[PDB]
Amino acid sequence: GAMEVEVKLRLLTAAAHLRLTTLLTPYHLKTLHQRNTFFDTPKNDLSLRRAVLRLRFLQNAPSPPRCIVSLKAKPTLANGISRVEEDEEEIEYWIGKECVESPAKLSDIGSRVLKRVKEEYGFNDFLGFVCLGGFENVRNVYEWRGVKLEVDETKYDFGNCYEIECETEEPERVKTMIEEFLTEEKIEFSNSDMTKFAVFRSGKLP
Ligand SMILES: [Mn+2]
């Protein structure tokens, strides 16, 4: 895959998130409704090898829903900056849905990314895989001061979490730009130290 580098900051409260979305209103591009689902063996073979296999179902708020398969490998997350190798590929929506119900059916897709999972992690098929479940996220996308901001409201059983992300080749300068703005506007933030999947799997608020 290619390297995804992003600024990743946590917004500390629902009020902070609301204030930020209000402030960013003029810059709004689109709102995405995402359902993230994840797959691994019962022995956590992918996780143990620093890999996450996600099927994301998405819908923009013609607008057909989409399913994107992602393999993310060898992530780092430190000081508000994420770097991870990512491979993504669109698959048919109805096929993705079938796989959530019956993970073995991942074996029946002619997918580039799923072939890469088989080859790189030593599987001949997905008969041994389970669905770990998943969670919903609402992503607001803004075009602001030359960057694309993604503001996330992530819905877990144990509560919601809120983040601001920005994919960029200049993560230090962009992180500074964002932090200065949040500080001036008195919005509560910190570095994000956990991925959404890691929060999900922990079963508790970070
Ligand atoms: Mn992200």
Author numbering: -1 to 59, 66 to 210
How does the study describe this entry?
The Vtc4p β-tunnel domain is not unique to eukaryotic polyP polymerases but is a structural hallmark of triphosphate tunnel metalloenzymes (TTMs), whose characteristic features are the presence of a topologically closed hydrophilic β-barrel, the preference for triphosphate-containing substrates, and for a divalent metal co-factor (PFAM families CYTH and VTC). Members of the ancient triphosphate tunnel metalloenzyme family can be found in all kingdoms of life. Our comparative analysis defines that most of these enzymes share a common catalytic mechanism in their tunnel centers, yet they have evolved different substrate recognition modes on their tunnel entries. The observed substrate plasticity apparently allows TTM proteins to act on a wide array of enzyme substrates and to perform very different reactions, many of which likely remain to be discovered.
Instead, AtTTM3 has specific, Mg2+ ion-dependent, short-chain polyphosphatase activity as previously reported. As AtTTM3 efficiently hydrolyzes PPPi in the presence of Mg2+ ions only at neutral or basic pH, we used two crystal forms grown at pH 5.0 (form A) and pH 7.5 (form B) to crystallize substrate-metal complexes under non-hydrolyzable and hydrolyzable conditions, respectively. In both crystal forms, we determined structures of AtTTM3 in the presence of PPPi and either MgCl2 or MnCl2. At pH 5.0 (form A) we find a triphosphate moiety bound in the AtTTM3 active site. Here, PPPi coordinates a Mg2+/Mn2+ ion that acts as a bridge between the substrate and the invariant Glu-169AtTTM3. A short soak at pH 7.0 (form B) shows the same arrangement of PPPi and Mn2+ in the active site. In all our structures the catalytic Mg2+ ions can be substituted by Mn2+ ions, for which we calculated phased anomalous difference electron density maps from data collected near the Mn-K edge to confirm their modeled positions. The basic residues in the tunnel center appear to be mainly involved in substrate coordination; however, the invariant Arg-56ygiF (Arg-52AtTTM3) possibly activates the substrate for the nucleophilic attack by forming a hydrogen bond with the oxygen atom connecting the β- and γ-phosphate of the substrate.
